[PDB]
Amino acid sequence: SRRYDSRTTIFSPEGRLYQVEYAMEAIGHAGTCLGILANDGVLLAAERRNIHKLLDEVFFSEKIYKLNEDMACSVAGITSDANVLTNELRLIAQRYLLQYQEPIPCEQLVTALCDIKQAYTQFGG
Amino acid sequence: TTIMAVQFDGGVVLGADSRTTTGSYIANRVTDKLTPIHDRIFCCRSGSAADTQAVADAVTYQLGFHSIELNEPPLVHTAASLFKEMCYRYREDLMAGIIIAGWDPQEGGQVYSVPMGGMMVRQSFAIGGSGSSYIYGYVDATYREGMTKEECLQFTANALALAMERDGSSGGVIRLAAIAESGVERQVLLGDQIPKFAVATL
Amino acid sequence: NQYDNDVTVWSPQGRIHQIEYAMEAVKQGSATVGLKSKTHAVLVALKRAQSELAAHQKKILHVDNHIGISIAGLTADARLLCNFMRQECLDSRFVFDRPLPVSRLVSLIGSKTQIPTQRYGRRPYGVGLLIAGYDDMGPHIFQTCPSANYFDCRAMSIGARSQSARTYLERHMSEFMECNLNELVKHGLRALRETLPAEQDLTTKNVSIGIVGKDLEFTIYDDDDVSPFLEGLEERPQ
Amino acid sequence: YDRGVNTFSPEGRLFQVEYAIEAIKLGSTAIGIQTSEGVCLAVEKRITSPLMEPSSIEKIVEIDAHIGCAMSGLIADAKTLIDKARVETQNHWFTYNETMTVESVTQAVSNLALQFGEEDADPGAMSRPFGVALLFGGVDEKGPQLFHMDPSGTFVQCDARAIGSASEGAQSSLQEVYHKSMTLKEAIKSSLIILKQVMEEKLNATNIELATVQPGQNFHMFTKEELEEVIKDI
Amino acid sequence: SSIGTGYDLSASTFSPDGRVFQVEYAMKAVENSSTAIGIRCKDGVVFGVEKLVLSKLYEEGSNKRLFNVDRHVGMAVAGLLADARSLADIAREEASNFRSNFGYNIPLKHLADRVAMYVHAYTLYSAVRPFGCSFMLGSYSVNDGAQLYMIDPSGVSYGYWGCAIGKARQAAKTEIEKLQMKEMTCRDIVKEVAKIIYIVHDEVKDKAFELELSWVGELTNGRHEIVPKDIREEAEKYAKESLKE
Amino acid sequence: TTIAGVVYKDGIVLGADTRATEGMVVADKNCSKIHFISPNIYCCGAGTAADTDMTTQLISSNLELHSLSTGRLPRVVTANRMLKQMLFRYQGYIGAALVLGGVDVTGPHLYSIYPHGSTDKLPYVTMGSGSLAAMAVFEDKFRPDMEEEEAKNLVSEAIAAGIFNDLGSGSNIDLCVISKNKLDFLRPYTVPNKKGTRLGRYRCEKGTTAVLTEKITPLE
Amino acid sequence: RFSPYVFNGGTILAIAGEDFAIVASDTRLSEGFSIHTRDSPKCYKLTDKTVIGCSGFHGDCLTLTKIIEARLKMYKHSNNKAMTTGAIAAMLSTILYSRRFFPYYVYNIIGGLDEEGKGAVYSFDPVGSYQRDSFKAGGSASAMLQPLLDNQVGFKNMQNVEHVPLSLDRAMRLVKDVFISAAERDVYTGDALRICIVTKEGIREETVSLRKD
Amino acid sequence: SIMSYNGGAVMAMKGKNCVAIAADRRFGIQAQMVTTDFQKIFPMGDRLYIGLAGLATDVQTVAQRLKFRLNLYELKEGRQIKPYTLMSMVANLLYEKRFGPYYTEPVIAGLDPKTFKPFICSLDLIGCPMVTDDFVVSGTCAEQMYGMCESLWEPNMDPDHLFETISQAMLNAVDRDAVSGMGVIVHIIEKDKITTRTLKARMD
Amino acid sequence: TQNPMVTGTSVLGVKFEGGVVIAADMLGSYGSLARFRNISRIMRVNNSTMLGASGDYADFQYLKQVLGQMVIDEELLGDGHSYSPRAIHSWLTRAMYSRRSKMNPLWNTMVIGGYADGESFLGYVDMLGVAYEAPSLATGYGAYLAQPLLREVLEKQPVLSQTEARDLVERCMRVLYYRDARSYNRFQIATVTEKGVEIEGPLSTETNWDIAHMISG
Numbered sequence A: 001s002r003r004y005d006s007r008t009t010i011f012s013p014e015g016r017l018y019q020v021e022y023a024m025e026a027i028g029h030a031g032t033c034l035g036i037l038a039n040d041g042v043l044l045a046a047e048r049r050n051i052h053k054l055l056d057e058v059f060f061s062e063k064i065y066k067l068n069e070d071m072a073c074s075v076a077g078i079t080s081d082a083n084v085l086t087n088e089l090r091l092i093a094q095r096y097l098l099q100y101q102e103p104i105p106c107e108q109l110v111t112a113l114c115d116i117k118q119a120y121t122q123f124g125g
Numbered sequence B: 001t002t003i004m005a006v007q008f009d010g011g012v013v014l015g016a017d018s019r020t021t022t023g024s025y026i027a028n029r030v031t032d033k034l035t036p037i038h039d040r041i042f043c044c045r046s047g048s049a050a051d052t053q054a055v056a057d058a059v060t061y062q063l064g065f066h067s068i069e070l071n072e073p074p075l076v077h078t079a080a081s082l083f084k085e086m087c088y089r090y091r092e093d094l095m096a097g098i099i100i101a102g103w104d105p106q107e108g109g110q111v112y113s114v115p116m117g118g119m120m121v122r123q124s125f126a127i128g129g130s131g132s133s134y135i136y137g138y139v140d141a142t143y144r145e146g147m148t149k150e151e152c153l154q155f156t157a158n159a160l161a162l163a164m165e166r167d168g169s170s171g172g173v174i175r176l177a178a179i180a181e182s183g184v185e186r187q188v189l190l191g192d193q194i195p196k197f198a199v200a201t202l
Numbered sequence C: 001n002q003y004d005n006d007v008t009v010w011s012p013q014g015r016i017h018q019i020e021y022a023m024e025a026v027k028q029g030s031a032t033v034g035l036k037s038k039t040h041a042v043l044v045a046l047k048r049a050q051s052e053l054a055a056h057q058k059k060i061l062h063v064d065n066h067i068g069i070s071i072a073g074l075t076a077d078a079r080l081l082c083n084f085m086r087q088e089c090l091d092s093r094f095v096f097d098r099p100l101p102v103s104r105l106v107s108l109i110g111s112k113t114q115i116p117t118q119r120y121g122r123r124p125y126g127v128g129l130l131i132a133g134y135d136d137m138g139p140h141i142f143q144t145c146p147s148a149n150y151f152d153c154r155a156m157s158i159g160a161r162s163q164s165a166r167t168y169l170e171r172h173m174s175e176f177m178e179c180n181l182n183e184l185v186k187h188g189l190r191a192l193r194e195t196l197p198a199e200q201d202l203t204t205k206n207v208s209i210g211i212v213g214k215d216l217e218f219t220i221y222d223d224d225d226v227s228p229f230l231e232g233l234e235e236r237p238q
Numbered sequence D: 001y002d003r004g005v006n007t008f009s010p011e012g013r014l015f016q017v018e019y020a021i022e023a024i025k026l027g028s029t030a031i032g033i034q035t036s037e038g039v040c041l042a043v044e045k046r047i048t049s050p051l052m053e054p055s056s057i058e059k060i061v062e063i064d065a066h067i068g069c070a071m072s073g074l075i076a077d078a079k080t081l082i083d084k085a086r087v088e089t090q091n092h093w094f095t096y097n098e099t100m101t102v103e104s105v106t107q108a109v110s111n112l113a114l115q116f117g118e119e120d121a122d123p124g125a126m127s128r129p130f131g132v133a134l135l136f137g138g139v140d141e142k143g144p145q146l147f148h149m150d151p152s153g154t155f156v157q158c159d160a161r162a163i164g165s166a167s168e169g170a171q172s173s174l175q176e177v178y179h180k181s182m183t184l185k186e187a188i189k190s191s192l193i194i195l196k197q198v199m200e201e202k203l204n205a206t207n208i209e210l211a212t213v214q215p216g217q218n219f220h221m222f223t224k225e226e227l228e229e230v231i232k233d234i
Numbered sequence E: 001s002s003i004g005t006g007y008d009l010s011a012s013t014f015s016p017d018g019r020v021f022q023v024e025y026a027m028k029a030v031e032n033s034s035t036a037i038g039i040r041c042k043d044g045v046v047f048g049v050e051k052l053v054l055s056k057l058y059e060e061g062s063n064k065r066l067f068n069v070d071r072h073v074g075m076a077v078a079g080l081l082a083d084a085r086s087l088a089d090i091a092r093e094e095a096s097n098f099r100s101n102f103g104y105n106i107p108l109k110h111l112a113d114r115v116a117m118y119v120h121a122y123t124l125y126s127a128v129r130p131f132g133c134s135f136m137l138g139s140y141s142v143n144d145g146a147q148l149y150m151i152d153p154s155g156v157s158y159g160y161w162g163c164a165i166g167k168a169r170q171a172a173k174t175e176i177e178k179l180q181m182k183e184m185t186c187r188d189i190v191k192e193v194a195k196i197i198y199i200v201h202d203e204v205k206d207k208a209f210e211l212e213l214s215w216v217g218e219l220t221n222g223r224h225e226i227v228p229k230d231i232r233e234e235a236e237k238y239a240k241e242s243l244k245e
Numbered sequence F: 001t002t003i004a005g006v007v008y009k010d011g012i013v014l015g016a017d018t019r020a021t022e023g024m025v026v027a028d029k030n031c032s033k034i035h036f037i038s039p040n041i042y043c044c045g046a047g048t049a050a051d052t053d054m055t056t057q058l059i060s061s062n063l064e065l066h067s068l069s070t071g072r073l074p075r076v077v078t079a080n081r082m083l084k085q086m087l088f089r090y091q092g093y094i095g096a097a098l099v100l101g102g103v104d105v106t107g108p109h110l111y112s113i114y115p116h117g118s119t120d121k122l123p124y125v126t127m128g129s130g131s132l133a134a135m136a137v138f139e140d141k142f143r144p145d146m147e148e149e150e151a152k153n154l155v156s157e158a159i160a161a162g163i164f165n166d167l168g169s170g171s172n173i174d175l176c177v178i179s180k181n182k183l184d185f186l187r188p189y190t191v192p193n194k195k196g197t198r199l200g201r202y203r204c205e206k207g208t209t210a211v212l213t214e215k216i217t218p219l220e
Numbered sequence G: 001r002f003s004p005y006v007f008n009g010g011t012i013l014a015i016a017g018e019d020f021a022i023v024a025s026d027t028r029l030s031e032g033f034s035i036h037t038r039d040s041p042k043c044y045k046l047t048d049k050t051v052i053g054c055s056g057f058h059g060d061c062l063t064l065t066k067i068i069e070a071r072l073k074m075y076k077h078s079n080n081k082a083m084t085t086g087a088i089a090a091m092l093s094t095i096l097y098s099r100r101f102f103p104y105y106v107y108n109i110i111g112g113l114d115e116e117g118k119g120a121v122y123s124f125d126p127v128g129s130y131q132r133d134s135f136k137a138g139g140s141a142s143a144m145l146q147p148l149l150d151n152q153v154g155f156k157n158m159q160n161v162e163h164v165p166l167s168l169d170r171a172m173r174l175v176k177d178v179f180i181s182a183a184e185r186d187v188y189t190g191d192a193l194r195i196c197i198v199t200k201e202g203i204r205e206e207t208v209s210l211r212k213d
Numbered sequence H: 001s002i003m004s005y006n007g008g009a010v011m012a013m014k015g016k017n018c019v020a021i022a023a024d025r026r027f028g029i030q031a032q033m034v035t036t037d038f039q040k041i042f043p044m045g046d047r048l049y050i051g052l053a054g055l056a057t058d059v060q061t062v063a064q065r066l067k068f069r070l071n072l073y074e075l076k077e078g079r080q081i082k083p084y085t086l087m088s089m090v091a092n093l094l095y096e097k098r099f100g101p102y103y104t105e106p107v108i109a110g111l112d113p114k115t116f117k118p119f120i121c122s123l124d125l126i127g128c129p130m131v132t133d134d135f136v137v138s139g140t141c142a143e144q145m146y147g148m149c150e151s152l153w154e155p156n157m158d159p160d161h162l163f164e165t166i167s168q169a170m171l172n173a174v175d176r177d178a179v180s181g182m183g184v185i186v187h188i189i190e191k192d193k194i195t196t197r198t199l200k201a202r203m204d
Numbered sequence I: 001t002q003n004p005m006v007t008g009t010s011v012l013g014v015k016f017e018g019g020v021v022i023a024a025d026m027l028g029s030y031g032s033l034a035r036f037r038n039i040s041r042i043m044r045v046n047n048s049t050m051l052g053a054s055g056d057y058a059d060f061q062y063l064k065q066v067l068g069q070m071v072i073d074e075e076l077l078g079d080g081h082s083y084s085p086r087a088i089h090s091w092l093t094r095a096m097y098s099r100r101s102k103m104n105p106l107w108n109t110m111v112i113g114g115y116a117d118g119e120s121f122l123g124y125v126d127m128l129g130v131a132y133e134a135p136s137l138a139t140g141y142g143a144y145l146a147q148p149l150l151r152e153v154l155e156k157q158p159v160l161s162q163t164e165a166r167d168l169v170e171r172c173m174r175v176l177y178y179r180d181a182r183s184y185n186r187f188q189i190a191t192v193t194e195k196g197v198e199i200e201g202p203l204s205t206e207t208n209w210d211i212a213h214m215i216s217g
Ligand SMILES: *[C@](O)([C@H](C)CO)[C@H](CC(C)C)NC(=O)[C@H](Cc1ccccc1)NC(=O)[C@H](CC(C)C)NC(=O)[C@H](CCc1ccccc1)NC(=O)CN1CCOCC1
Pocket: B001, B002, B019, B020, B021, B022, B023, B027, B028, B033, B045, B046, B047, B048, B049, B050, B052, B095, B129, B130, B169, B170, F092, F114, F116, F118
């Protein structure tokens, strides 16, 4: 039991979290995705890895998710984890809306998800 | 309702009326109150229909698994004990008067009563249900030890007939079951088959 | 080396090393002796001191009016087990208004201490006990090990260099059953002192006595109350 | 090679506990002396910077009006134990309308000894022993008393005791000057002397802290001036 | 028959040849224990235990390897004693629950089945280790008969006419086979049990030993009791005398 | 309500009215009270509307799962067990009186299920506020092994009795015939009640309603 | 429905002297209009220095008694000393209040010696409210006992009388007198009077007789 | 009655290729009016409105939680919601509180976002759905509304006749109820546009 | 149990020289109905004690099961210790009070008779956990009818012989049969001595009805 544990939430001797860095290495292999801020708007632009002749194209997008009527996001890395996080983001947004009766400020949503990710880095194994 | 069970030598005889009422309306004039728990173990139900049905189902389940796990014909006392446990544990939530009776290779024909309290006692014969009140005297004056199977059959038939005649909550048809090593002989007394008695005239 | 660190791992030789390592904890403490006559049960314990400025460690604990113990090993585990026994005794008195039979208490100790020797991440109790008690089966001296095994004894010694005490008691078993209290405590003290080099011997500062019997509840004599027992003993040999 | 936190050595001891004992040896050395006129506790503060406010370093704290505690090792671990002690004393006062004996408090804190483990445990339960050592000095019905406790949970009464990095030497120096009849002034003096010996820094009024608990007076933390007035007669 | 490269550190781990070495190791712990035998006659079951004495300081009857599991069921154990006692507790509780639920004394086959299942439950996870002991359950009834079952650390349960567990398991079995217990009675059987115990005992390697004995049959109204001192000393005399041939 | 059920030679006929009330006011003039359980099992619901709905839906779902895993056609005893056990677990707090009818591999089966969890297997059953009238029609004009049209006539007659004699029942008669190889879910089997035709024109012409505020909003 | 309470009667009294403490009670256990037993003292010896009197509902009396015993033992195991009287009073307060929302139907009076050897009484209410007294009564006949002791021991409403301290003898006869008078009017008080005297020497038990009607 | 605590009235009517939904504007506590501009009709998307009558708190709460689930639905799925779907959603939401129900009786009126087919339904407080082809009512003056609707409603009404009909129904029903009124609002919704009007009504 | 169903009435107990005697009729009543006229309301708890019970018969069967199991559990050890009558009484008190405090009582009033260490024991236990010891005990109507007779004798002669106590018991059962409408002319007598516990079979009580012919004069 103690033998099979890979110790995912543990400091390395240098004072760093190895699983996080390895996850970064995973992200480095994922499709390129950038975003730019302007005066009259803001945009996302991402490379598509789901590019094959036989694909059906039944969704509005591939790496662009709508989170809120005032907010959208793009993703890079493991797509399923991305699905989880995006769904959770929508949940958070709707909770804030239900509570204050106004759209959740962007930074608040971001911090809200990031607290969950950090929680996954600090405990739980 | 009005149930009954008498013990003879090689087994038991069960009997019940068939009236099921909600208020003063008869929701089922032809109920089957004698419920099979095992090959040679039956129970007579009285009280809440839902309660007795649920409990009977549960006990059939438990006793089935138990008999399979032991690979032996289940003791009647065991079935009666399962009923007893259920009815006693949930006495404040159940309205059930049960008479568990049947045959068993180790103790032969047995009859047990599990009244609303949750207690359990073996009897030579047992009566229950709303109608049982009207036949205590008759059943006391008519019972004789060493009755034959057919004698017990006629006995329960007469008693149930009387009770059904007097009790408004009882009536319809008479259901009888004979249980022995041979098996289960079920029959139904209806109309003119049901024993009649002289009603006062002038 | 690969079967050393968990209590749920059998060795290929049919042994559990963590249990035995736990057994070694008993020998790490100061020695103690227990013996019974036919009317009295007696524990004699050699208290140990760190420096000369530190008081001597308690070795005898009160459990119930009819039961006392002498510990050997981890004092924390000792306190745990002690509180457990106390609790069980109190329960018995609360429920039945009669004192808990010693053998049953020992059985409960066995049952409790056996559990953590079979679960991952758990550990055996690092403590050995000598239990002196009196009930309507007479006096009783019991011994409990980290291996959750227990023994009914006529006499026993556990701990550092307790082999000498054992060897002594094994010769005077026959005498024990008829001794009066003073002679019994004497024998206990001789057994205890056998576990010492000739340069040192028993003192009122380093000896504790626990006594229970038909005429006496479990009592603990520590300092000046030990002198009536020490004063009345041979000079011992070299 | 990693193992469980409740693993036994072949010698018959718990690894984590022994390692905690090893951890104590890196802490500030403290000395407690018992005297029929009262108990005294002294400890070096080990200031690592002139910028650090020395009054924010407390290795001597008040458990209750009649009991004080000195600590050595991982102080952060000690804070919990201190609060537990205070709470225990107050609970006892609430329940029985009386003060706790020093031994009872010491035992109570000592009950949190081997309360650590992995499996079969609570979510908030301790994962490791407390890497700290304690000296409980106080006055009860049995007069002045001094107790010592280590991560093993083994607690014992001492007439004079030193814990910390300079444990052995200070203990020897203690044995050389202790007789069970010293005056409290003699105890304080001796304590500060041995402290000055074992300390690497020059002993002054802001380098250490000293506190006394006497039959007639509550727990008293020595102020700067009083400290100076004892250091005076060096 | 000897692999151990991490494949033998858990009951949740199979060996490459399909074995669970933890269980086998526990069985080896059973093998290193003093021999306990039990034999069924036509009118009951008799138990005999070679209870080795580790010290003369221990009282007589200390460390009993014969237990009363139920008023009609006795238990003879072999191996790690603490585990054996805990298992005795489990068996007792099982019998008690059965009585409280069904209203009569638990049939031996069923008790053995239940306890065996409980034992087997420990041969499957890394969170717990298999029990380090084997045991025998003996009982008698008029409606049931004379019955003797045995359970090993793996959880296997079987019905025996004669059985032994411990050091000289086979050495005892060869001696039991000589008997015709299908016709003999528990009265005669006791002597033969003590005899086989004395034969199988190794007076050289192992030191002094105490002999434990147990009745359960028609001669005891179905109650599992300890053999009276008279019959025990009689059987021991017969055994000591039969050892000179 | 006024639901009924009968067993004939080739299968089962289920009947129900279509009146749903709140207070002493008709809320729904056309309510479907005959529910889909399985393709071979239907169930009439009387009592607390939402309860009958959610209960019948849930059991239908569980039976779909069941048959999906078993690969066979669902049995009526299964739906009966599920229903009675659920209802009994809630001790009557789910106001659902039911008439469960279906054809099996064992034949035609008809149960009545009361909200307390008790069931009755009978050749003919009635439930609802108008159940007494319908049961009178059954007790008067029932015979074993009827032909399909005969049984349809009998059941529709019963439901009609419920409709005209009970203030709780009203409007249409819905039938459901289930044989060993047919499923006739006849919706408006009979419309014995009709609203009278308007005798006037109360149509309000554009402009008669005074307006204080207006706001048009275009869509797409 | 079902009531978890029944009044079993019983009167109780404690007087504190300079060097003594008296705790007395009748021995009648009754229920409704019937006598359960005439041999049921309401006095319980806790320690050599402390005696407790408990009246009211017998179930709660027994239970609370056994609880107090057990916790005395616990304290003894925990602090290596016996519980002082005032400590037992405080503990009893907490124990009684622990059932603030399902109270012990028990009137409690503790009599004993303090740490200076002097006498002390502690009177309780069923939920833990207690205070120290020189003398107090409780139980059924409480209102019959109290006024006389207010007059005779407290010297209340008496002009130009001397404040002579209560001796053990006078206190004893006072107890016997108030109980004898109470047996006349209270129907729950009778049969026998048990008196427990607590001094440095220990605890004496005396038993006077009361009428049986 | 709990429903009568705040009062109010909600009605929906069917048209040719249009639909209508109206409600009074009074927010009152028992007998006192607190507000005259209380919203009881909420848009659950383009060409789909819901109208809740009953206990004001549960009106607002059910509306809000419904918008919660709706938003999540239209996010998970790449489409606007169908009327039937919304109805089942509300039914589920209400029935989740079967033994502690919200005290509101919702009325859904809209047009199929794919087609244009008109749709009107109403529900219990425990979420029992009821779809009709003419009208649905819910409120303290349900009997009056039934009275008007049963006599005014015609089948294929144009967006102008529907307005007049539902307006007269609401006005004249509400004017016979003491706790409903203080103004009436009507939303007449069609494929191209949505027209919102507040009627001239009694304020007593 | 909040509403008792089948119940039994009075239970008597009295100490004598070298033992204790207890009596109880064999009737289980369903209200005013004498439903089960052949049931034992007396249990043999080991060889030194015994129990009689009034109130709900089912709960008594439960306590019978539990106590039987406890006695078996103890007898399995054979460590030379056994439950004294006082111990059983203490346990029963604890149990009844525990159920009382859970607001779910065992609707019983019980009399425990015993003989151990040469002393006669007689204890009473309520459904509320009210318990005590006395030389004589009577539950239910007995407490109003039989107990006054018992006390009259015991205060005139504290020590009774077994035959004397048995006679007293018989007369008390006669009085109870006369005046208690929920009793029955068919009872049991259990006895503890040093020889153990003995329950005597179905006994009847002779009845005088001469006062039937005293209507006129
Ligand atoms: C038997 O005992 C004899 C005939 C004497 O009663 C029969 C036979 C049994 C085995 C079927 N028992 C009954 O006929 C029995 C009486 C009973 C009533 C209430 C509780 C327990 C037992 N009838 C029923 O159980 C019957 C079952 C079906 C509907 C056929 N249901 C009821 O009696 C309703 C019980 C539910 C309940 C109501 C209130 C609180 C809790 C539970 N009683 C109703 O009144 C049902 N209902 C509402 C009122 O108007 C009529 C319909």
